Amino acid sequence: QQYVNINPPMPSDTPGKIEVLEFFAYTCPHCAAIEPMVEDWAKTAPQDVVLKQVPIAFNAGMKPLQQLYYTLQALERPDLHPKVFTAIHTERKRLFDKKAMGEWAASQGVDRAKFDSVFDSFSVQTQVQHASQLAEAAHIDGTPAFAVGGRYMTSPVLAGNDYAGALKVVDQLIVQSRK
């Protein structure tokens, strides 16, 4: 009813843990709205569950925003991740290409040369490719969306058009994923 099956199931990337993938995009207003609720949910999630946030690209212009996510993670600035949403949606900053992104990161204390180097790195390119591979295998059709255990997919729309309802379904799917 409030979720769909992923067939064939996706293989697990975290032994002994149930993976929850939140597929998101920085440009998605609902991803921005749900982000603090996801961060709060992650604080109380079961210890055998791991949350991964996976940036997606439905058109090629979204690929720099995938690179931005993995660049901030590689620079060990996860504090800047929620601030990207705020900068784009509340402060109306146009953080849509590498140049604007690097200027914004530099204003946040990131060395510009390191940002630019990491943004172009093979490691980031591989993570972006993997993010799009995961979205393809999970049969993504919008954001925000949640894949649970590599086997089930839900979203606020599927869970009765409600953010908290989506996370309640995620909780139900976690129990199901343990069998």
Author numbering: 1 to 179
What sentences appear in the manuscript?
In Gram‐negative species, these bonds are introduced by the Dsb enzyme family, with DsbA acting as the primary thiol oxidase. B. pertussis' single DsbA (BperDsbA) (Heras et al., 2009) and DsbC (BperDsbC) enzymes have been shown to be essential for both the formation and stabilization of the pertussis toxin (PTX), a major virulence factor in B. pertussis infection (Scanlon et al., 2019; Stenson & Weiss, 2002). Notably, it contains a highly destabilizing catalytic Dsb, resulting in one of the most oxidizing redox potentials recorded for a DsbA enzyme. Functionally, BperDsbA shows limited substrate promiscuity and selectively catalyzes the oxidative folding of a pertussis toxin‐derived peptide, supporting a model of substrate specialization.
The structure of BperDsbA was solved to a resolution of 1.65 Å using molecular replacement and refined to R‐factor and R‐free values of 16.87% and 20.16%, respectively. The asymmetric unit contains two symmetrically independent monomers, both encompassing residues 1–179, which superimpose with a root‐mean‐square deviation (RMSD) of 0.432 Å across 179 equivalent Cα atoms. BperDsbA shares the canonical DsbA‐like architecture (Martin et al., 1993) with a TRX‐like core fold defined by the conserved motifs β₂α₁β₃ (residues 19–63) and β₄β₅α₇ (residues 130–179) separated by an alpha helical insertion domain. This insertion includes a three‐helix bundle (α₂, α₃, α₄; residues 64–111) and two additional helices (α₅ and α₆; residues 112–129). The active site includes conserved catalytic residues, with the CXXC motif (C28P29H30C31) located at the tip of α₁ (Quan et al., 2007) and the proline loop (G142T143P144) bridging α6 and β4 (inset) (Ren et al., 2009). Although the protein was oxidized prior to crystallization, the structure revealed BperDsbA in a reduced form, likely due to radiation damage. In this reduced state, hydrogen‐bond contacts were observed between the sulfur atom of Cys28 and the main‐chain nitrogen atoms of Pro29, His30, and Cys31 within the CPHC motif. Additionally, Cys28 forms hydrogen bonds with both the main‐chain carbonyl and side‐chain hydroxyl group of Thr144, a residue located in the cis‐proline loop (G142T143P144). Furthermore, BperDsbA exhibits an unusual surface electrostatic distribution, characterized by a positive patch directly above the active site and a negatively charged groove below. BperDsbA also exhibits notable structural differences compared to class Ia DsbAs such as EcDsbA, including a restructured β5–α7 loop that produces a narrower peptide‐binding groove more consistent with class Ib DsbAs (McMahon et al., 2014; Santos‐Martin et al., 2021) and distinct surface electrostatics.
